[PDB]
Structure formats: structure tokens, C-alpha cells
Symmetry: D2
Subunit: 333 residues, 4 copies
């Protein structure tokens, strides 16, 4: 028996501070997407959330660096509640919050909203992948930036979803490296759509969306990595050719690090060098980071991923300083 | 206001006869999927349905051939109501039945159910692509076989949907030719899932599915076609290695015809030649066919696709006679 | 499952003509309630509807009289779908349309709406008792005048319901003859209320009504009858003292006929005399009339009541000619 | 937007202790309704609840006496959240919890459930008048005894409601003294009914109830008081003639005390005298009591009624000692 969004909205209404932070962070990201500001968006944090307490501890550390580098970097935390599996597997905190096959979705939605509210209230904006068609009504008001995953960028129902979101949306290139699907996605999501959706009261209805003018692509590797200057330039030419923004984000993880978390730093160094030389088509970066590096099958060690391996806190400080220094020079030209 | 499925079900209850046809067609198709019967499933008809009159005229002609070829072929009509676009475009009869950007979804769902009930009552089983998450509750009881399209095979929400459908489901390979995503899809949709869905009364709820044991892959081309014997053999080996059915379906259209409707017949000739020689991994074929060949942007010509170009009626007779003759020989061995 | 009102509204939308007739008739009745017009409202027809066909035949007869007497009388048909029982029994057409304890409420609501639409389309306006809190959303758009029964006039939920209806409403005095509860009810229903109701989509919600300015009392007997000049005079004085309309309706049936249908004419004759002498505080009369007089336990005879006994068609013509002649004289002064 | 009952049930689930108390108390009352136990039910407490804190303080005091008198009296608190008005006014803590015309019904339902859970958790069972058709789903699980008020005992929708409640229900006699309507109500409520209702999820549905076997009448005065032995003997006779339970309850307040709240003591003395002579048909009494006696138009004094005037705490001790003492004697015969 599924509680509707209005139940959770009643227990956890958005605060004045959260609402202000979300509104302005979305505006600020739009500025980067359209080349009006030259700060780098940094979407950074765990591959997935499985423990809100560790998430809050992580966020308080990250908040210090968000503040420190606010003139060069726009730091937003990865707060991912839904995970696309290759076949089957744990789908994330919403689907199965007790991490044990009980699928307590009401609890998971409450936890997701409570965490997001707390994050925004402390001054840390949040990002997530929007995978499910129905869950966004429960928490999209607390999200400053959304992703559509590699496995769903080509999907018309996800392009519809994005078209109705009030935050900027990044579209990842396909799992084998297809960029055109993400360019096409921006085209689709930027227009108005009519489709079936579910209201805050829990009832199906006809949605009519206005289109989302703040979509961009995310380069996340394919059969080969696609983060280097040659790839960026080629993606930018294809973006201009379709008449959509040629400012893009680069994912340091997934198929760009080839699932070796230690190579996220190499990718970030390549990005730093691009920003120093020129790097005019880059508006942001994505990084898989947690309190503790690596991964584990079971949630035994605190602050360590149970999905993709992440860099730890120490590498995270180094990586953020690197990008901030590199971007300060880009902004000086 | 969106009418819930129960409103349409009340006006258009499934009949004894339609219900019997669906049940036995589903079972017959299962038998093909699991290699218990050597008839060839043929999913044939329009790229998209834009005019119920032409649909029922098509059905009337096809029904004769379904019956003529019943010992060699299991003929099921393509009755596709939901169309994935590259970027933007008409998304099908459900989404915009008046073809004029009025998006009269209540009318569209009603007409879709009506057509499907009329088709089944006349003895023609129906197949469709399940693209949307909420629309299936309105008509899935009238569907004998379902496709998940190339653009959504990798999508976890579509694999979830398939896991709860009561008909067999074909998963298409990805738009650039990736077959592994479809094999992964069978493994995912065979399992139980828990996810958010909408009930027949129009309210969101937690769905718990039991898995769909009758999924298979569809070879529909990528950067290159993949219909030939080598590709079929290569796919069957991959299917066996993943522990799933090695009986598959071949699409004569889309990327296998290089989007050229006149090349569907070449593909079918190649399949016929495989069936004559051996062809033991082939359980089905797909064909885009309409009263009149080609395509048009505006619905000016009766019985002519407004989406992908189709072969015409006479070409349809030739293609079905070719496959039935070739499969008669395969079954006789 | 209960279909929501929107299902029925979709199948039986109100026509231009029915809409006009309801609007006009409500306005015309308001004028009577407020003494702007001295025609006599006549709420006439069956105790209860149990057969649509006979109801439409009855309406076709009554229409000729409605037209013949239009300058003196404003004739509106009783089309009562909801029956309040003393302890238990058949609660009317909506609750149990097949008259056999199957409680097929979806069918009953559909049939009630269909009958009302047909009545209005033929030029016959309709009245009913609003007993249930949920059923009115299904058909109130087709009702020109409503009653709150003797057994529910004191009920706060019924007074709230009346406050949100767009038609004039009559409140009957209580079953032992208490008139103050109906005076009290006009007061309550003329005010705005907040309470829980159900939407046209079938979902509970908070209703905020604006009050119904067109309510009045109905004298329907108690322990003793209350139709005479003395009683009318007493009620008018009490009405003025409460600051509400002193124009009232008199029921010729129920406790004013001592539950004996052959006494309705006697009551009508008394009223006729009052109209002739003065009768300034009478705005209307109610009469239980059917094709065939009396009642029956089973629905064996066509056009004969299965609830309270009614006068038959011959007596109906006499009663109406009587009231028209008497009111023509009132109106000439 | 109205939160459905499931939202409140999620925040405030019934505890094991509260569940057991309600279950046990309903059964205990049933035993008194059907003559299996001769303890006297005493429904005692405020006319209406307007301040949860005072209500809990009152309950802590009453609890001590509930335990002290448990062999003679079965004490259950009046926790009335819905108030029927003569015309207009404050309809209770649910309809307008802030006592200022803001009608914050979401808040009021939450506060009502919270108070009820806390009462049950401390060991005090609770009673209320069920006036509205929709609100009971929010808190009926915490109610051990229910009333249908004098203004609604004749109403078929209230009899329907009663037929589906899982607690015993008392039907009050009519405002002018009519006892037959309450006897008819028991008859009606003991039967199965079909009717439209709203589910815990906030959606309209067809309810099919099983009948309520534990209903009884309440004597609360009329044109004349009806608390004495002669009226009780006449009531019992009429009950036996209708074939329903001849055990009844006597309200010491309302039209039995008329314009003197202190007269509840006289009524109680009369009842004590009946219990001492014989008093075999009395199974309960009702008393309006609060921390501080009297009433006020505005909620200025802590623990003093804002609707009907109540006896104060010292008089409450006195009235309960009186009844316990008298009933101890009846029980010893
Ligand atoms: Cl995975
Ligand atoms: Cl009756
Ligand atoms: Cl009826
Ligand atoms: Cl209250
Ligand atoms: Mn990851
Ligand atoms: Mn196509
Ligand atoms: Mn009647
Ligand atoms: Mn009171």
C-alpha cells in the first residue's frame, strides 16, 4: 500500500532555506550549461547511497570544499537512490532500503526525502539519477541536477520525464559509446510532451510538460574512454551540428576509468590539462567518491560503496584542488 | 482528466472468444520460444496504426493467410500503438489519435482497446510494442505477444514491465547492434521484481511480479545487418552461454533492411534459405507490411504508413508464401 | 470496482439542451423561492424509479401538461433514485438496479444518469432526494431541484451537502412534524461549509462550499397533517422570525395524506382553496403520481410503484387542472 | 490536499497495547449489551475535546477511578471530535483544530489520532460520536464505543456506517424524544448493507458490511426527560417487541439535565436508586465531565468546556462513587 507523495511532503515540507538553495543552484547550473559562467560543475560523491548517516558525514566534509572553491567550482553532491543493474541486483535505497530483499519502498522513499532535505538544509545541493517514472514526485523538489543514465538516454519515457523536470539534466552517452543518442535526447527533452504520469496524490493523469531548456550531454566512456580533448572537440562539433549546447560534462568514472577507481584521478588530470590549454567546451565533471575507497559486497565497513568502487576522502581532496587550480586559470582568460 | 483502465474495461469487456484466442496464442508462442513446436511465428503488419479502418481491412486480408498457412506459420498482426521517435514526432495513436497535436489520450486508449477487441473477436491475435509504463493496463489483456524496442531493451523499467506481462516478450538488440543487452534483458525479465506501477483503478501501488518465462531476443540489425546464418549461429551460442533460450526472432525491417522497405524480401529469402538448410534456432520473423507500400509524412493515402516505410499487400502475399514453403520443409525433417 | 463519476460523464456528457433546461429551471425555481414569480412549482411523479421505460412514458405524458400549464405551474418530474427506509428494504435504483439483491451500483449509476439525460433532452426537468453523500457527483448536473428527506433534514452532513449543490433545495419537516429543524437547515445550508467529500475522479478531498441561497421548507406532515392555512400561517411567521424565505412547499403525500394515496387530492383541494383566498406563502406542491395508481411488493405490473402508493394518471390530470385554475386566480391579483 | 488515512496510520500505527485494549474493551461492552456481565458502562468526559493536554490530564485522573471501580463500572472516556450544531458553529477539533476558522482538517485528523493513541497507550479506552462518513477511517481503530447522535439516528447513511463499525454503537433517541427511530436504527445497523464509502487509501468504493450485533439505544431526553424507571420500563418493552436487546444506556446530560449541568448528579442519583431497587435493563450511563465545571465561549480557562457545560472533577468523583456503590449492590443480587 503505497503512500502518495503528499504524505511525505506533509511530514517533510521543503524549507525556505532548501527551496532557496535548490532554486539558485539550478539557475547557477543553467548558466554553466549555456556558457554564461565558466565555473566547473562538479557532481561528486558515492556511486549509491546505502547509509544516510555516512552520507551526512560525507556531505559535511564536502561542504567545506564547496565553500572554499566556490569561485572556480560549483560542487553538488551525488545522492543516487536508484541504480540500473546490468541484469539483476540491488536497485538502491528507495527500492530496498533495509538492504535485505524486503523492498520496503515506503520507508525508502521517506528516508530518501529526509536525507535530501537535511542535505539542502545544511547548504549542500544534491543530484540523482532519475530512473523510475513514479518516484520523482517524492523528492524532485530537493534536486538541483539530474542524470539520465547510459542505459536509458535513448528511452522516450526518460526523455519525457526529463522534459518535465525543473532542474538541469545531463544525458549520458550509451554503454558502447554512442553520443548521438544523448544529442537526440537533448532535442527531445527540450520540447513539450504529453504523456501519462502520476500526481502528488498518487493518481495517474495526463502530464503536459513545457520542455527543459537546460539539458546537456555527459561523456562516460564506451568500448573505449571518451574524455580526451580529441573526443571533446568531436562531441562539440556534433552538438553544434544539432543546434544544441556544445557545453558538456565529463564523467571520470564508469567506462572512462574502466571500473578502476584509481584512474578517476588520471582522467581528472587530463581534464585539468584541457582546461589549462583551452577546454572551452567543458562545463562540468562527475566523480565517484566516498569516505573510504574501494567497494564491498556487503555493507560491513562504514562509508564504503556496495556498488561501484569509489575514491576515498583523501584522493577526493586532491582531485578537487587539482580541478579548482586548473579552472582558475581557465577563468582568468 | 484521465479515465482509469476500469472505465475502458467496463465499456469493452474481453469476450469469451477473445480471451480464448489470447490464451491459446500465448501458449502456442511459448511453445515456439522453448522449442516444443517448429512453426514459425510471424509478427506482421504496419509500422504503426494510425487508422482503425485500414487496420481492420488489413486484418481481414491477413486472416485468410493466417488460416491458409496455419500448419507452417503462426501469424499474429502488428498492432503498434506507441512509437519511439529519434528526437520528436508523432508517438502513436494512443498519444495523439486525431493526428493533429490535440493529444486526446482518453479517446486514443478507448480506440486502441476497441480495435484490439474487434481484431481478436474476428480471429486475429495482436502484438504490440510496450513502450509506456501506464498504458498497458488498458489493453494488455488483448495482446498475445509483446516487443520491447531497441531503444528500451537496456532500460530497467522496461525489463520490470516485461517481468509482469502475461504474454511472451521479444527484446530487440540495441540500435547499434548490441545483442548482449537483449540477453541480459531476458535474464532480468525472467526474475521477480518489485517496483512502482499504477493499478486498474488509476492509483499508484507497489507491484510484485513473478517473472516472465517466455522472453526471447529479436535480431533487427545495427550498424550492419544481423539476419544471416553466421549471425544467427553466433547469437545462439551467446544465448546458450547465458543459460537462456537459443530460439530467436529475426526482423526483416529496420536496420536489417537498412531502412529500405524493398529489402525486407531479401532478408526473408535469406531466412527461407536458412530454414531449408537447417535454421533450427529460428522461431520467428518480423515484417513491416501495409495495404500499400512506402511511407508519407501526412495521412493522405489510405493504407500507407506515416512512420517507417512498409512493403505493400502483394509483396506480403509473396513473402508469406516464401516462408511457409520453406518452413514446411524444415518441419518435415 | 466503483467507477468514478468521470467514467459516466465521459459516456453521457450533458448536452447543450439539457444544460440550458437545467440552468433555466433552477433560475425559475429560485424566482419562486424568493417570491419574484407566483407560478406554482409542482414536483410530481413516482415515489421511486424502478423502471426507466415507464419513467420515460410517464414523462412524455407529463410534458404535455407541463407545456399546457406553463403560465400558472412549473412542472418538474420526481425521479427519485435513493429511498430512505424505516429499518431495511430496497434503497432504490442506484443501490440495487436489478431489484434482486445484487447491488450492481455501477449499472445503477449509469442507468440513473442515462434516464436523467434522456428526460432533460426531451424537455422534462428532474428532481430527486439527495440521500447519499457520494452518489450526487454522478448526476447532480442533471437535477433542477433537490429534496432533503424528513429523516435527514436534521443531519449536519446533509445540510453540508445542500450547501454545495447548485440547485434549489427543499428541506422536509421531521417525521413527527418538527418544523424548526427545516428552518434550522435553511440557515445552515445558506452558509459556507468545510467538510470531506469525494471528487469526480473518485478521490476524497476537502470541500469548501459557498452556501445555497435557494433553500426552503416542505410541509409533509407529522403526527398530524400540516398542509392547512393555519399551519402555513404558523410556518410563515417562524420563517420570517429566522430571517429566511417565508415561501414554502406543501407535500400532498406521506404524512399529510396519512400515507393514503386517495387523500392526496383532498390535500391538493385544500391548497387550491388557499390559493384562491390568498395563499401568498405557498410556492410549490409535491405529489406522488405514476401511470397506474397504488403500489405492489414485486415489480409485476408496469408503471406501478413498489414503494409508496401513488395516484394514477387520470387523477393526476384532475389534480393539475385544479391547481392551475386556482393559481391563475392568485396570479391575476 | 487531503491526506488519506494511510498517511496517518503510517505515522501513528496502533501499538500492541492499544490494539489489545480496544479489542478487550469492545468485547467487555458487548458483554454488557447482551446481559452477560452486569457492570455498568460509564461513558464520561468532556462534551468536546479542544485541548489535547487537558484531555490527557483528565484521562490520567479518570484512569485511577477506572481501576478502582473496575469490578462495578467499566469506565471509558468521552473523546468527542465531531459536534452536530443546531444551525451553525464549531463542528469540533477535526473540522477546525486551531479554533479560529482556518479549517485545518489534515492537522485536526493527525491531532485526533495522536490523542487517541496516547489515551489507549496509557490504559484509557476512548469513545466518540461518529458524525461524518469519511473521517472514521482515520481513527476508528482506536475507538472502543461509538455513538450516533440524536440528529442522525434516523439517517440511513449513519445506520449504514454503524453496520460496518467494529465497536459497539449507541443510538440516541431523537431530539424531541422519539425512541422508535433508535430501535429501528439497531434493527437497520444489525444487517448487512451495500453503499459507497471511502477506503483507507482515500478512494471511493463499494462497501459491503456484515452488520453490527452490539448496538443499543441511549435515552437522552426530548420534550421531557426519559431517565426514570417508568421511561426505562417502556423503552425495554418496545425493545423486546422489536426483537432487539433490551439493555440500554441513559445519558445524564443533554435533554435529561436540560438547562442545569449540575442536574446530572440528580439523574445519576435516580439511576443509582433504580440500580438498587432492580434496574435490570440499564447497561450504561453517559456523563459530561471535565477538570473544571461550567463552560466558556472562548478557550480561556484550562480544562473547561467550550461547548456544553460539564461537571468538574470533585463532582465526578462523587458521581462515580455513587454509581459504583449502587451497582455493586445490583451485581450482588
Ligand atoms: Cl551491475
Ligand atoms: Cl419504509
Ligand atoms: Cl429508486
Ligand atoms: Cl471536538
Ligand atoms: Mn556508479
Ligand atoms: Mn518501424
Ligand atoms: Mn414516497
Ligand atoms: Mn454535549
Amino acid at each position: 500500500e503505497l503512500l502518495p507523495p503528499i504524505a511525505h511532503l506533509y511530514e517533510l515540507p521543503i524549507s525556505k532555506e532548501a527551496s532557496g538553495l535548490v532554486h539558485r543552484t539550478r539557475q547557477e547550473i543553467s548558466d554553466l550549461v549555456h556558457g554564461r559562467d565558466k565555473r566547473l560543475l562538479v557532481i561528486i560523491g558515492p556511486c549509491s547511497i546505502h547509509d544516510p548517516k555516512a552520507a551526512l558525514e560525507y556531505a559535511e566534509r564536502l561542504l567545506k570544499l564547496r565553500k572554499q572553491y566556490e569561485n572556480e567550482l560549483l560542487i553538488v553532491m551525488r545522492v543516487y537512490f536508484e541504480k540500473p543493474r546490468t541484469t539483476v541486483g540491488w536497485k538502491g535505497l528507495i527500492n530496498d532500503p533495509h538492504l535485505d530483499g524486503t523492498f520496503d519502498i515506503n520507508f525508502g522513499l521517506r528516508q530518501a526525502r529526509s536525507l535530501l532535505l537535511s542535505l539542502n538544509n545544511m547548504g549542500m545541493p544534491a543530484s540523482t539519477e532519475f530512473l523510475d517514472m513514479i518516484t520523482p514526485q517524492y523528492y524532485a523538489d530537493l534536486i538541483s541536477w539530474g542524470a539520465i543514465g547510459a542505459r536509458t538516454t535513448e528511452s522516450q519515457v526518460h526523455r519525457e520525464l526529463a522534459s518535465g523536470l525543473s532542474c538541469p539534466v545531463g544525458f549520458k552517452n550509451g554503454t558502447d559509446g554512442n553520443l548521438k543518442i544523448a544529442i537526440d535526447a537533448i532535442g527531445a527533452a527540450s520540447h513539450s510532451h504529453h504523456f501519462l504520469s502520476v500526481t502528488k496524490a498518487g493518481h495517474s493523469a495526463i502530464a503536459h510538460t513545457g520542455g527543459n531548456p537546460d539539458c546537456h550531454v555527459i561523456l562516460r566512456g564506451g568500448k573505449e574512454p571518451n574524455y580526451d580533448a580529441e573526443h571533446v572537440s568531436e562531441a562539440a562539433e556534433q552538438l553544434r551540428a544539432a543546434g544544441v549546447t556544445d557545453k558538456l560534462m565529463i564523467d571520470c568514472s564508469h567506462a572512462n576509468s574502466r571500473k578502476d577507481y584509481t584512474r578517476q584521478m588520471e582522467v581528472a588530470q587530463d581534464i585539468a590539462a584541457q582546461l589549462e590549454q583551452d577546454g572551452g567546451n567543458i562545463m562540468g565533471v562527475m566523480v565517484e567518491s566516498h569516505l573510504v575507497e574501494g567497494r564491498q559486497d556487503k555493507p560491513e565497513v562504514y562509508g564504503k560503496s556496495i556498488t561501484d568502487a569509489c575514491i576515498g576522502w583523501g584522493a577526493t581532496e586532491e582531485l578537487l584542488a587539482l580541478l579548482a587550480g586548473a579552472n582558475k586559470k581557465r577563468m582568468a582568460r
